[model samples]
Target: RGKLPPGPTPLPLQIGIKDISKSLTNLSKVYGPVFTLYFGLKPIVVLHGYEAVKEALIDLGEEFSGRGIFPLAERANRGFGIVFSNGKKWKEIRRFSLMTLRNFGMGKRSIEDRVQEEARCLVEELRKTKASPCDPTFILGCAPCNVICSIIFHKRFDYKDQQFLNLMEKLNENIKILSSPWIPIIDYFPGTHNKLLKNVAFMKSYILEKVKEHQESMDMNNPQDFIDCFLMKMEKEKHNQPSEFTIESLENTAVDLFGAGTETTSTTLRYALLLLLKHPEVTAKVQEEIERVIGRNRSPCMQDRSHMPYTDAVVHEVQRYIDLLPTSLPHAVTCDIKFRNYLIPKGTTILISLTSVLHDNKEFPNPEMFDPHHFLDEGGNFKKSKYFMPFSAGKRICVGEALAGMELFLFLTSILQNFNLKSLVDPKNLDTTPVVNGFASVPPFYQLCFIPIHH
Candidate 1:
């Protein structure tokens, strides 16, 4: 018999799979760090905690670099884009994206300028609210969406534009259904899945239309944005019969950048605001640091991040405490591998438990608490941890890591600089826990006042 890691017998219903990270962490206590759990006939290898996850993902990175099947994503994307694609295609598109993002197509405008512009727009929009209690969801989303929009399409949308609102609505709705606990019943209850596909179809058509627009007006020498660069690449590879730069790949890759870039950063920004509302002292210290470093006159920049260690630590702590995407996107082994005492075969699906490392008690004392000190040293410098893998680690890590960092810092700092966060309820009563804890950690629905600060 094949020697798989020790684990509890598979249930026909796969009852425990629905319980997600908490249940898996508990099971890890019973069945060691490396264990196999069967989802129906499909066996998923779970790497729990820092050591196991690090070894498999980092030490044996090449073997673990292959992207595994994600049912919902696979259905919509069909392994076309960067997130779900494996091997050659993944490499080509990922490299193109990283290079494209790193080397901007925005022509003379730095990515920081795009993000800062959006932050200014966001501040103006929030000022329109006049310090009233607003949800902070839609506008928060709009800012990041516009940041990605400026990158991909080289234009930002009006926050009130119907078409723009519709696209954001679709992205928000799809992520909710995907992260909803009921997602596992996609077969039995197909309505949500059908809606998911419908939303995806609409978004895909939207991206396809933009691709067409870029093609019609593209300047080969002066590529203005992501779409232009992609079109230029496609033209270059046209002679090659089976080039990876097809129109379909272009649309899907745009969709990947558009969707992935928007939600994760926006959600983190929203969560950061929520946590700030819960802990006013942390917010005060960050704002004081913001005032001392950049002051009220000039806008915050990436350059100021180094001088303000406490603010930097708070941002890092928010990501860690939230533990977004607890079980990272599934990874597959490229070849048959002997891992520790067990032999994991080629193409076996692996789930690296990000929650374990993000919340590992040893690295972060009081792992459950929302303390910025977790990321700050006794001397008050920004303490970086290898375990800070909110965006995951190694080969298939988030393509938008640096962009997300810039967005989080600039956006959060800009907002705090202009306004004092005022929660309707007492700060002590504010519950900082996420409402939805499935695929993503969604912050609870809450409203707060953004009282503008006078210099």
Candidate 2:
């Protein structure tokens, strides 16, 4: 207790379980920017606001290198995949993943083409609705998942396919479990958490099957998709370093990439559409900007973002306003560190609250409102705010930041240019409240009508 940070007095284990989620936000308010809480036996320090988060996650990144709060994640990845692992395993896997993503055309024009094709397919799917109310979540989910699938297996699933839909549903459900209050309990007492563990195990098995299929069907000579590159590396390094690229590691890494790469970007798009439905004036402005720049007849691409500054600003503003992940993946202090007046001890988990920063009233005037002007200058060019950290900051920051940005920009521009989106019910009645139970935050289900705007 001498080394621990400032926080609330310990509550009974049962009481802590009952109030974990609500108490996290409440504790921040009571204890200020940096506060501590005990979830069962584990102690967690939640860092609030931009300055504190930046100071640790960005400035003192080396001292805060461990992944602090993922119980099942550590078991599944077995300290091998990029997201869950630490030390030598994390370094190797993260470096390999970055290289594999690059080699498979992550930043290049080729991958942008793949995303564009998916966007076109998505538009066509929506057009089939004939301006009627349709829940865009499934369609939105399919498009981004397809992009990730293409990267991993060089294949895309049919939008209506049963297996594909089941996989997507499982992924979404699993994300919910990750952020649930039960997670800490599951971590602290594995015996009581068997059922949830079994569910995650099932999801892991499903992903493993997909990986096996990719391995069997892969064309090693051509080396297309992530699996091919991974297999090629395995073959090359197997003799020299047998443990470096094993089947288990490959499967887990693929699972991490599939899960993280797909759900986060898609959910944000889902929320963006909901926000557009709620704010018609802003939506129309975005659409008009898209038309003036890209034109309805031509397909929108990542490159066109420069010409559509207003639309670009609107997308950035949406990220800032919604701030999907209020608290980023926790990082443990690798060594003793002094931040301001506080002396943070080694092994303490640091929760960087990205929400407090993105919504800081000083940086973003009227932070609660959905104003694209927050990301724009007087000359109407897209401007970035220091407080804006949707993907977080520093060494362990999101690896797919560039790809996600490109996908969001191109898809939003393409969709807005061709379709006028509106809520099925009155905007006031629609539930805009987020379903807050995952590493990524998502808006609740709602239907929308997409009216095609003829050129």
Candidate 3:
């Protein structure tokens, strides 16, 4: 206890589960850059501010190599997959996953084309609304999910597919459950938490069925999707190194990728649309820049970002302003590491408060304002900010970052280029505020009219 770094005193039960996720803005205000809070019996250290978070997570990252999974996630995932696993297992899966993503065209032109085509499909769906107010959350979520599905399963479902929608809803519900305080208790006392465990089992079973379907249909010679690639690897290595690759690991990895890749990116895009409706001037600026650089005849691609600096800056700024996933998934110290005067013990859990860093006033002069200039220079070129870490930094950064960025830029710019986004309610009455749902932050339910721009 004496060696542990400072944090809040232990509290009985997990009283503040909702507050843990929603009160980040308030917590940073009360506790300064680095503070501690006890969730159940566990002492979790919260690192805030740009400099403090950078030091703990980036500057001394090797010390914090473990992805802190609450007990239940560990049981469900079997300590497998890149997100929850550490050391050799994580390394192999991560390397293979990155290689497979690259081979499947993640950052390259081919992937961008897929995103553009999806964006066109999305816009076409929206245009059917014919200037009527529509809630874009589901529509926005589907596009990115389809992109990942296409890469991993080699198929994408139609927007109105009931099965696809059911799966997406279940995935979202699982994210909510994992982030809840009940998770820690269930992890520690699985016998008593039978109901919660049952729910998780159901979700895992559904995902496993999808993985099997993918395996059955995959082409061994061509290796069309991520599952095909993993199957090929399994065939090559199974006899010699059985432990290295297995069916369970492959299925869990696919679930991890699908869950993280789809929800976070789509939620961010939803926030971008909501913000655009609230701030018409910024929206107009982005549209003008996109039209000037990439005309309406051609859909916007990731490469076009080089020429459309303002649009790119706005997209970057939207990510920064919205500050999704404020308190990143807790990471643990793999080994004893020292930072400044404090020594972070091996296996100590450290919370990298991504929201505090992104919203730090010192890093971005006006943190509260929705200004794109924060990400751009006076010459109107995009500039990277040290505090701009929506996907986080260091060794365990989000694996889907490149693909996510391309999807964000292309989908956002394409939508803005074709439509003039306007709020259904009075601009002043619109709720730009976010509903904090544990790990992921999302905008409140709202309607927007996308008036098409006729050249």
Candidate 4:
């Protein structure tokens, strides 16, 4: 495919390695949005800015709907599961997985209740901190894990449980490993003791146990959780020679949904806390809105979101400002398609640089500044921007988008509604910059006192 987009030139071995994503955004300024970049020897088409990304992923979705397998994913998942699979495999698993999760209450009140339950559990866990300044990472991280476990494993492990701790650690480590550029070097080589592989093996084995358990005790008409549904589907297809629904698919799907459901949103929640702490004025405004709309005694719900414009804006602003998964998970073109005078061959890897869209200087003025006003119109009402692509867009958009959005909105609001977050340090001393932790933009780890708001 010689008809490729203009991008950075291929370099010898080591050079052009650092900040590859940022390099693509910068190069796009000159070459325009869609450009090819040489990552060592391979050419990757980089889609930057709102227009470029929207055009490729949204406007020409099927052509760009393929999932690109990174080194880490290839080794760890091995083309299994919903996230790592592509082609017919991806299509089959994604559809089944989406339908299965939705049936298990992905967008409904059933899932919402799970999150709200976790939120209540989160509140109690925070209460144990007893207003003393403490790290919010683990607690904030656990809420989503509980939701994931409840759906996939048919039970919610206590956040304090040892098994639960190990689960969280593995999930966090795996997300980071998959997102790292270093994966091509570290995990791709022979006999490497990659945490990703080890953790994935553990996850697969763990899921296998759950699946086997379900197989022994499955009631066909009364399936509960995603795993049970998959088991029933596997039974239905056992007689078929080439069944897509199998024991292995069940294991991989569980791993994918479990991992994806937790990390992206959990990391975003952590960042949300830091950003709110850094902007006490914004925090106070959310508190004011919550008090007016949700009341002190009532727990915040999904419905409360529409009435709380400032809080909603802050939530949107958190996702935008943090810009989690800035470059997004790698994707590919399904067929040799013409895109902006370029022939993108089937399986040509595409990197939708989400940072360029979320932080496009033309779209979001003072993009670096964490301002809730970025999402608010002059009348102070929340206005949706076409540029927001945190969960990405198009057919391959994150399946957990609705659930994650609800988790962020409800969990954060519930916390803020009952507590006045106080940064352990002077508000001015708080570091607004992300720690650049792993694949996600994790806020700098710091303690914050959650002073409860008594009615």
Candidate 5:
């Protein structure tokens, strides 16, 4: 332990403190990139800025790929699913999941079709607002959740469906509680743990019911959705001892898909709209490009993204400026390894400051400001920056990274194409800062009018 990176003596505070990302960024200034600090009894090595974060996550992907214990996930997931599991379990499930997500239907209908279909549905739902002011929280939440539902259950619920709304509410509430400062004192917060666990139980059982339904009508040659694919894997692995594929694992993994797939992308889209509402000129420019490239005659497709550099840059900048998942899910060193003059023992919890890499001033000048130019070159083309890591990098990067990218691009562009966003408050007075700055970066609650654009 003496060989560990130099840092402060043990402290009583937990990293769940308010704006902990900012605090860690400050601490990194004092202790440098690789430094150690105590989060309760755990010694966490903080990796700040792009250089340090890249060296560990990208350069030494395997050794630093271990999934650290995230308190909320550990309690709810119980180390069963892809997000929190470690060792062989994580590898098998993650690999199988990636494969299934990619090759599930096999050209019958691409995942792009699923997202594009959902984007169309979302636009229709928003258009129903009739240019009246409305809180977009629930409406916005339904779209992404439905996209995952379509992939997992091969079904999408009507936005008015009560059961679907209940699931969305629980998922939303749990995220709020999970990011609360009182997270460290899980038991002290009355009903917080119980409620959160109940939410998990509800979600898991909901998934199990769907799994049972799928099991009854199983076709060996014709598996439909994620559930059927998992069932097929379970059947194949039945003869193998100590197999990771099981009914329980399927339930947990399905929940992981929903949790990871839903909130982050939805939050980013909501923030994107908020940013556009704050900067109408940006929205005007994007709408102008959309009209020029795709026109009102057709839906925005993945093909159009390459041709529309300004819109693409706007999407990238929104994600970078918001800095979602500021401190990405905790990572652990799989084995005792030396990193940058410091010997980090195996299983030490490491916090990679995604906020640092995202907001690095060298890459993004005046990182605090919200500007699309950060993602666009002087010649007005989309410029890719290595520092843009909202979905993270390396071995443990988000399983839904590609899917999220498609959803964000499709949903944002589709909405802007159909409607002109009108802020209830003056555009100049609209605030873009996130409301909750913890495990997830939640945009503040706001109301807006979606004025339908005439052809």
Candidate 6:
């Protein structure tokens, strides 16, 4: 009878074998939008549908804006960086981090310039495949991380560079583990727990080495990359007592920025290609739109997106159907008093069940199927949907939202403009299902062939 919003009794480690949120969605028919599930003693208030996610994230943004408890982040980052920090530390670093990204041109034309630069290499790499089957997972994975290196590490890596390849292996290894729904379980799982420690050590080594390298050769007045920018900030805050700026914080912030910056976007890009391969008609429509709007004679730019509605719609639909980060990042109640009939307490973790929002049958008819018309109107133009919350919403939305969009459009369209993507098998036969279906949805991988188009 208490205001906790009725849910199933505690199941703990028993229920995570399949995508449990799918079951919860079914339960909502009887229990309503706002409900709860006790993962042991902890209560997670799940907000389902556009109405629930919107009201909690947007309507009550302030009270529901806190970062939730991530077990790995707590064990590793320990509340030092933007992604995991809480209270004053979270506020201090979030403002500074956002400002730093802006100063470094995250969303501006300069970022596009960097993207285009890397994309040229991507196109050239694809060309070498010579219409033979090649797995795109590694190549696509490293390209975005190279962009992160350019912005944050003040350098770029060749696609075949051994150092870059080694780093990618580690990054990808950690990323796959983190994307699982079973993080809290893995920490206690016998063998993986040790592996997680090794992974942590591998990650921390990279962060420390990069931070040290930046510290050694940085110019305070003219900061080179993000690491330099933060080093500069740390120098300024040195005199202020009790300042949050420190080496540990800076290193963890690097982890937060670089890890978030690279992996998710790369995974999304891979998924986009997978979906395109599965739906060739949709792919052809996008290419046709791209050819009409921006011909093969020149490179595609950001401005062309408005003119290329079909391409734009396909991009939006790819995000909607995949729902990359399904549960979004775990968010917490900053201070709980009341929202609607429920009297929730402060510090309760909130899961904005994005699976509920993007896959809603009413908003997207047959939401599981990949369809560009989901974001298109009767007038044959792209239509934005309120239910589309791929990057999540509210104060804790993805920091790299703009960069990700720009990269997706430019890299994807640029490829489509130059080459005809060929599925090795029937496009329809490709598995559109996710390899993992929790925090992030990595589409099933398949070898892709790229045939260069003639003007």
| Best of the two (2, 6) by TM-score | 6
lDDT of 4 by residue, 1-455 (tens): 45887765576122112254566666877888788877686878888788888888889988888888654434555577777777777787788777765665232337777888888998998888989979887888888889988888668877679988887788877665554434334322444347667888898898887777777876877776788777776777776758788778778888878888887787888888888888878888888888888787877788888898888889899999888877778898888898878887777788888888899888789998999888899898888899888989998989888889889999998898778888878889777776533355666778889888864
The collision pairs in model 5 are none
Measured against the true structure, the TM-scores of the candidates, in listed sequence, are: 0.95, 0.87, 0.88, 0.92, 0.95, 0.92
Candidate 1 C-alpha error for residue 384, in Å: 0.8
Q: What are the lDDT scores of the predictions, listed in order?
A: 0.86, 0.75, 0.75, 0.78, 0.85, 0.78
Query: What's the C-alpha lDDT at position 408 in model 4?
Result: 91
Stretches of candidate 6 exceeding 4 Å from the true structure: 12-18, 72-74, 104-109, 179-188, 436-438
> RMSD of each candidate?
2.2, 3.7, 3.7, 2.8, 2.1, 2.7
Give lDDT tens digits, candidate 6, residues 1-455.
23788887786333332365677687678779988879788898888888988998999888888988765544555478888888888788888887766655232326677788888888888888898998888778777888877877767898889878877777776676665555435434445546666765676688788888777776756676677777787788876856887888877777777788887888888888888888877888888888788888888889999898888888898888877776777788887558778988988888778888889898888997888899988898789988878889988877788878888998899889888888888865667777644457777868888888964
Can you give the lDDT of residue 35 in candidate 6? 86
Segments of candidate 5 deviating more than 4 angstroms: 12-18, 39-41, 72-77, 105-107, 182-188
Per residue, candidate 1 scores C-alpha lDDT tens digits across 1-455 of 34679777775222222257888899999999999998677788999999998898889988899998765553666477898789889989998998888865546678889999998999999999999999999889998899888998888988999988999999988777666553434322457878877887898899888878887887878887888988888888887868998888887888888889998898899999999999888998999999999988999999999999999999999999988788878999888999999998888889889999999999999999988889988887889899899988888889999999999999999999999999998977777767744467878899999888964
lDDT of 5 by residue, 131-250 (tens): 999888777888889989988888888999998988898898878877665343442366678987888899999999999899898887887789988888888888686799988888
Q: Which ten residues in a row have the lowest lDDT in candidate 4?
A: 12-21
